[PDB]
């Protein structure tokens, strides 16, 4: 679509290998990013450096937007590539000029910002209101809706490790392993390696 | 410093709104209703809440004069309100349809910049809340909440530190604790000489 094509014509596009850190928490923010290809994880940490996954973002998602609207702001989280990525970049200064030329590009960015607030608010609800079983169950549903999930005769197939699930839902790997065994016994999933089939999705 | 600078973008925006007055405790936005209208707080304070299936409430945010509300449906048609918003004081609230506001954006996108600057701050705040809920126990969440509240513009200076006006029930709704649990932990923090429980958070 022509708004995005115009936007991307004002960016530079960089390639990043999987596992590369795109954005470091607490660095001064001067640049907006947009995922042309690939996916990333948005991470925060506790004081002893345990990570939690706030969000996955995918092709077509803006990143690094939270610093755009106020001078002096710092990055609010880490962003790490989970695949090879191609990521467009543009300075906030130049983007602010583009918005005045054609605010449709701000509409596209703001649409994502609103969705992210809705989704992160739902995550707050899950953490406040659900037990570990309820959280893992909801997480397996959510992962089954990510663009990289694969169709399967019995539902959707995902590849994710127990550690990674635990970092999404706020559980130990051990707790994840125990609940996944229970869900398998209840015939709600199957698990083979880092492969999980989420039935009925 | 003193003496308000005129704000032409805001005055233009407000000239296209209708203002309505809402008493304390009134519901401004009802979760699950179709979203077709944007609001802006001219005066007053609100709480943004979500509820579980048993009606336990969690407060996501307090919002105040100069805050937009009901913005999250603006960018795609057919969405529902994502949370409840309730008046904490008497409010004066400007309202405008999403259809008109979208026209204003094309006239002067600075009004969308102001709205989006608030969405960005809210995302930072709500993301920190996700980390607190995942990483901290009840005492940790309560300590962090008191620390946060004492840094709000509406905290009052006190000979012993900063003073906040908030009930044990309200803290419970922020942190995900019963009010009795909050009361016990506040007594712990008081015995540790960190606070006095309005609540005074010590500092010099
Ligand atoms: N809750 C969230 N959901 C989705 N993305 C997020 C969230 N929190 C932070 N981010 C992204 O991570 C980025 C870190 O840098 P910024 O704060 O500039 O912009 C941030 C957002 O793009
Ligand atoms: N996490 C949050 N922080 C601050 N405000 C919120 C949050 N979630 C929802 N809201 C506000 O509550 C409103 C509910 O109606 P909308 O979803 O239209 O728009 C929403 C925002 O104005
Ligand atoms: N996990 C939770 N446990 C207990 N109360 C909670 C939780 N999450 C939210 N709350 C709300 O926090 C409130 C604190 O005051 P109450 O004890 O009157 O009622 C409580 C609920 O409405």
Numbering used by the authors:
A (entry chain E): 9 to 209
B (entry chain A): 3 to 199, 203 to 209
Paste lines from the article.
Altering local interactions associated with V140 was predicted by the ENM to have minimal effects on cooperativity despite significant local hydrophobic interactions; we therefore examined the effect of decreased and increased local hydrophobic interactions in V140A and V140L variants as a control experiment. Interestingly, although V140A protein showed no global change in structure, there is, in this mutation, a significant local conformational change evident in the crystal structure where the mutated V140A residue formed a new hydrophobic contact with the rotated side chain of C179 that is not present in the wild-type or V140L proteins. ITC experiments demonstrated that this CAP variant with the identified side chain rearrangement was positively cooperative, thus supporting the qualitative prediction of the model.
CAP is a 210-amino-acid transcription factor that binds cAMP generated by adenylyl cyclase in response to the phosphorylated form of Enzyme IIAGlc (phosphorylated in response to the phosphoenolpyruvate-carbohydrate phosphotransferase system). cAMP-bound CAP regulates the transcription of over 100 genes crucial for carbon utilization through its binding to a specific promoter region and recruitment of RNA polymerase. Previous studies of the ligand binding domain of CAP demonstrated negative cooperativity between cAMP binding sites in the absence of structural change within this domain. We produce coarse-grained models that describe global low-frequency protein backbone motions of CAP and show a strong correlation between negative cooperativity for cAMP and modulation of the delocalised normal modes on ligand binding without a requirement for a spatially distinct physical pathway or conformational change.
